[PDB]
Design a protein around this ligand. Sequence first.
Ligand SMILES: COc1cc(C(=O)O)cc([N+](=O)[O-])c1O
Ligand SMILES: COc1cc(C(=O)O)cc([N+](=O)[O-])c1O
Ligand SMILES: [Cl-]
Ligand SMILES: [Cl-]
Lengths: 349, 349
Amino acid sequence: QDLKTGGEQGYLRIATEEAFATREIIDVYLRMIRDGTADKGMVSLWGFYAQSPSERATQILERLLDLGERRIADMDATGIDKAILALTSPGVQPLHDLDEARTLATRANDTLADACQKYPDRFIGMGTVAPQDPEWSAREIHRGARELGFKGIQINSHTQGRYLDEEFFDPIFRALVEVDQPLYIHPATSPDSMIDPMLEAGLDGAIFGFGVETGMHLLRLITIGIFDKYPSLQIMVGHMGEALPYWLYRLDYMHQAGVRSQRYERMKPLKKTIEGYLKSNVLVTNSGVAWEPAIKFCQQVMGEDRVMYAMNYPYQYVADEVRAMDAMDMSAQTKKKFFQTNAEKWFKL
Amino acid sequence: QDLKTGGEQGYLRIATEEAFATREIIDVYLRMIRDGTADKGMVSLWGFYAQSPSERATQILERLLDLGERRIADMDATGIDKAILALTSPGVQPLHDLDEARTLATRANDTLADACQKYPDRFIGMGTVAPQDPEWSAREIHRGARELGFKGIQINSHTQGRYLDEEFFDPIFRALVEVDQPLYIHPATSPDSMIDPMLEAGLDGAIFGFGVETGMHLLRLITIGIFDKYPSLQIMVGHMGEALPYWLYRLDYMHQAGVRSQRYERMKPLKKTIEGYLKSNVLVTNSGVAWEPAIKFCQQVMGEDRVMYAMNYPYQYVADEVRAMDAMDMSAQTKKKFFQTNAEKWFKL
Ligand SMILES: COc1cc(C(=O)O)cc([N+](=O)[O-])c1O
Ligand SMILES: COc1cc(C(=O)O)cc([N+](=O)[O-])c1O
Ligand SMILES: [Cl-]
Ligand SMILES: [Cl-]
């Protein structure tokens, strides 16, 4: 079963959640780990990826750092026509020195824009920001859209234990709506306030902690009414929607029960059900979930227009996953939406 | 009038996750709230249910405390033939005074056993323990199985921030294997080490935090190798498996990645995949999830023999949910397993 670029099978493969790193940023993580300012998540996640002697961690690091011929080759070998690229979690979000965070985010964005320019038919950019400074972040969203050819931004969930439902972060949403671009909420390790029981069992990372953190964050945003405030805003999440589609019946039941019993001041009546917001304002990718039953479930819940293919390169670079997706028992029209035309629509490619 | 007991529709309706309270234990929660020894989760959960004048809270309290004709009338009105009853979360697990914990658990168990004796064709008991004292808990498991006629025990997830994968709790598992009975791991609020970001958003309870806490607890039991140490052990969870069936592909992928890379001391090779353990040692109810797509997904993933009906009375007592379950697009044979015969098998009714 051959994996070829060019769309001869009836669609292009557009991979919508693909990571890169910059040497300068990984070096800051290593410095933070050495000087004791790294949070427990950073020590766990980047203490491993930047310091494990294994062939595997080593290959992920090398692949993350390449934005040229090797990445193109890996894409060609798996039949990936286009990749939507974003700076790997947690970006500059954990950094205490804001001059450094803004400088390195600017440089990461510059580097990405240069790579997309060099490979305009293969690489598509999502910008990185420094939510610590929402006003600068808003300017960088405009710069991404205006000068850099970027299609949106990726935020790596929380910023130092603070979440985007806080009014403090509103300039970011204001800017996304001004440029009419989607937000990808990508996972991160939980903050120190929440991580301990997961970390002790080995569950703080992609196995579990990622989905908890990210699902929590998107749920918080839905329930604060972000989509009533910003009805045009689209938020994309990976990993088959961080379980929210499967939890949907219970989410809506318990959300309505809480509101009606006036349990939490924070939880106020919304204009739509959570189901309603999933169908109008949330977009999902299958990153890390090359599994047909889950994909089909999620298509049924959210609509086939709102579920997209993502590989999660280089953390999950598996040719047999692409093969299993190419071979799903799904109509030609639906498969082409999933691999290609959904992404083309929602990222305005 | 259209929901009837007696099984004329082809099956009995056995509700496998039904709650009661004792006044004296609720009073201890109130005391702990007043004296500042309650954890944040108890304050949130029981500060609401024991004190709110809302319709939802008052009905829950009233129904939780009844183990006689009012409960029977509520069951008759919704066609529920039998209910498997357990002391409502968090039971005695948060109590600092062990003598008090052991005493109140004993009394809750004797109270339940009295009710089952009085209505033996309607009420089935799961016992409650005090995992703070694992050895006492082992003896109470003996007593439940051999003297009180109970079919298993329910543990309300964590005990004072500690999880059952610790060797400290091993006497509980030894005892369950000895009497050959299932453990139901029911939710609780997250411990103080994890709860803050959920609590601040109104998400610490059943809407989200419950699933995070219970899924993490089952997952860490699986990854520590509990089912290799005790291959006969069956662990039941509600809420459609706390999303673990939906996450399965990601869980197995990332579990294997973590094992092979030696990332974590508590994540070593297991004899089966996580999927393997779901199909041989884990059992699921649909408590809180009266939703055909999720039920069918779960049946597909774990096997239709391993998925059972639960109402979650009184937290979710909805005649229209029972009607929706009766109307599902399933064979008569599948429906009978789901409502009746799986429970008869797994609880040894
Ligand atoms: C640093 O970012 C990631 C790390 C990993 C991992 O540790 O396996 C997974 C994904 N992911 O999306 O699942 C990441 O993007
Ligand atoms: C204190 O026990 C529970 C509370 C809630 C609730 O607050 O709605 C729901 C369930 N449940 O399992 O969904 C409970 O068992
Ligand atoms: Cl606690
Ligand atoms: Cl292996």
